[PDB]
Amino acid sequence: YEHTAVMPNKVGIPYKALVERPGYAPVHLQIQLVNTRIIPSTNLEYITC
Amino acid sequence: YEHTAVMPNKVGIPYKALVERPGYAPVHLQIQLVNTRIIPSTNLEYITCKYKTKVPSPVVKCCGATQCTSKPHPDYQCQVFSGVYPFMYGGAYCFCDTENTQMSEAYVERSEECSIDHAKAYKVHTGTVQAMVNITYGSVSWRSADVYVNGETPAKIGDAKLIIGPLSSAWSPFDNKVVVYGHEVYNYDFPEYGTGKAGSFGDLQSRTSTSNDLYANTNLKLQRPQAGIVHTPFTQVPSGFERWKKDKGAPLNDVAPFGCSIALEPLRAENCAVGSIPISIDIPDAAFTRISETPTVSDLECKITECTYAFDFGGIATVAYKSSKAGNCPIHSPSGVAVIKENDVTLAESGSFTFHFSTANIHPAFKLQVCTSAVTCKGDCKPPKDHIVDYAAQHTESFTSAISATAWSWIKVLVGGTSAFIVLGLIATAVVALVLFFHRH
Numbered sequence: 304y305e306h307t308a309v310m311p312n313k314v315g316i317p318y319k320a321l322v323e324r325p326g327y328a329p330v331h332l333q334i335q336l337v338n339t340r341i342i343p344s345t346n347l348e349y350i351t352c
Numbered sequence: 353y354e355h356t357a358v359m360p361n362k363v364g365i366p367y368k369a370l371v372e373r374p375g376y377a378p379v380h381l382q383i384q385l386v387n388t389r390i391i392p393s394t395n396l397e398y399i400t401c402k403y404k405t406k407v408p409s410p411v412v413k414c415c416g417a418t419q420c421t422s423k424p425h426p427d428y429q430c431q432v433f434s435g436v437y438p439f440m441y442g443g444a445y446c447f448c449d450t451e452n453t454q455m456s457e458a459y460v461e462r463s464e465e466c467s468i469d470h471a472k473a474y475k476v477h478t479g480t481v482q483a484m485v486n487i488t489y490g491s492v493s494w495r496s497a498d499v500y501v502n503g504e505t506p507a508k509i510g511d512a513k514l515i516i517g518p519l520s521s522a523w524s525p526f527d528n529k530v531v532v533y534g535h536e537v538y539n540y541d542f543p544e545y546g547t548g549k550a551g552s553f554g555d556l557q558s559r560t561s562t563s564n565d566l567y568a569n570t571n572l573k574l575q576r577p578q579a580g581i582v583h584t585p586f587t588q589v590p591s592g593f594e595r596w597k598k599d600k601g602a603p604l605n606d607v608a609p610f611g612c613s614i615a616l617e618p619l620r621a622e623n624c625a626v627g628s629i630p631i632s633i634d635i636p637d638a639a640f641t642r643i644s645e646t647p648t649v650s651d652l653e654c655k656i657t658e659c660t661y662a663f664d665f666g667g668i669a670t671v672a673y674k675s676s677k678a679g680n681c682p683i684h685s686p687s688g689v690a691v692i693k694e695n696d697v698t699l700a701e702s703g704s705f706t707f708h709f710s711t712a713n714i715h716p717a718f719k720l721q722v723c724t725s726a727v728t729c730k731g732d733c734k735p736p737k738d739h740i741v742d743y744a745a746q747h748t749e750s751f752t753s754a755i756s757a758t759a760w761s762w763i764k765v766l767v768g769g770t771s772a773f774i775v776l777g778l779i780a781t782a783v784v785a786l787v788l789f790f791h792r793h
């Protein structure tokens with residue numbers, strides 16, 4: 304059963320919801336981010352020393 | 353006790369009802385069709401298969417000539433070819449160079465594959481309709497029997513006498529002519545026996561697969577033998593049976609309306625969802641319990657806790673009650689709004705019970721019958737999530753099933769707006785006409 308939502312981009316703050324499936328009792332869902340990483344693509348231009 | 357009703361011609365969908373006999377507690381009745389079979393009356397016209405051409409040894413007359421005679425063979429051919437000078441392994445067969453004749457013969461017969469690979473042409477007329485039913489009533493468990501859908505032949509099912517009326521529709525998937533090839537049935541307008549054309553389906557026709565009288569119509573023509581060669585060449589139109597098998601198209605098995613399934617022994621169309629079935633079932637008198645001998649149910653309150661108008665039993669309701677004797681109690685909803693999954697419940701002195709139901713209505717409002725009593729259930733239903741399901745709907749949708757309370761408000765406002773506004777003009781006209789009357793008087 305697919306549950307769709309939008310959670311804030313926060314680390315350490317859990318996203319909580321009840322997954323409501325017709326005919327079934329709600330299932331509590333908790334999604335928490337441990338870390339989020341922006342990993343850009345880089346090309347070495349040169350080395351200075 | 354006789355119970356009469358009309359149930360839809362739906363296989364696998366149960367018919368549920370309460371048998372209400374005054375002075376006795378209602379007995380819950382459930383009738384479910386296992387299968388429905390339309391069995392037309394068929395008459396075999398002829399058998400078609402791939403032909404085989406028989407070619408007897410030719411007669412080679414040296415230094416002379418012979419003549420052909422007719423023979424009683426299918427598509428028989430005979431031709432005398434003069435001026436032949438055949439050779440064999442031993443050299444020239446005949447001495448004379450020109451006074452030399454070869455007589456060739458050929459005729460058509462059924463191929464050996466005709467014993468297994470052939471098509472049967474049947475004339476199809478109306479016939480018997482049969483069905484198998486699964487029936488329960490009260491405390492009697494499921495019993496089943498094969499019945500005739502004619503309204504005249506009774507059946508004894510679990511000591512109950514059932515009479516099934518004729519289908520409300522005379523529809524049948526078979527035309528007046530069908531061709532049975534293998535497991536497939538075709539609505540093919542085959543040519544009558546003796547009128548088949550070369551290269552077409554009926555080029556070869558036989559009344560039976562063992563008949564000694566075979567009709568064949570091919571352009572079997574004897575050709576002149578090649579110079580110096582002893583053989584019997586001929587030309588003939590390719591078999592129309594093999595041609596038909598290539599072009600036979602979609603069988604009735606694949607195109608029959610109403611989901612009909614086609615079976616061959618006997619030829620019949622099964623589980624066609626057409627019309628309705630009048631019924632009459634006699635419930636034994638011993639199955640009824642007097643009112644005073646059954647528990648009394650009152651103080652009913654029905655709460656719908658969940659509802660989706662899905663094809664499955666998407667609704668759930670909880671019914672609070674108070675009752676005496678704490679016995680078993682039949683449950684039924686006579687309204688077409690919702691179909692109840694449970695047939696009966698076990699009651700305590702006081703408490704509540706739940707039941708499941710299926711409905712197409714966005715706002716269900718239905719009467720639930722509880723043995724000797726009844727309660728009205730109302731609620732709202734959500735749309736289903738699945739676009740496509742692999743099971744048929746348990747409920748029947750009505751004209752107003754989709755109309756929401758918001759839609760009803762708009763419909764009532766538009767109707768009420770014009771009704772009040774038009775009447776206002778009519779009222780104003782009637783009053784002003786009277787005012788002018790009093791101006792004169």
Ligand SMILES: *[C@@H]1O[C@H](CO)[C@@H](O)[C@H](O)[C@H]1NC(C)=O
Pocket residue numbers: 386486494496
């Ligand atoms: C009648 O219904 C019951 C339902 O459990 C089933 O077990 C039984 O096989 C059915 N009878 C036939 C002939 O299908």
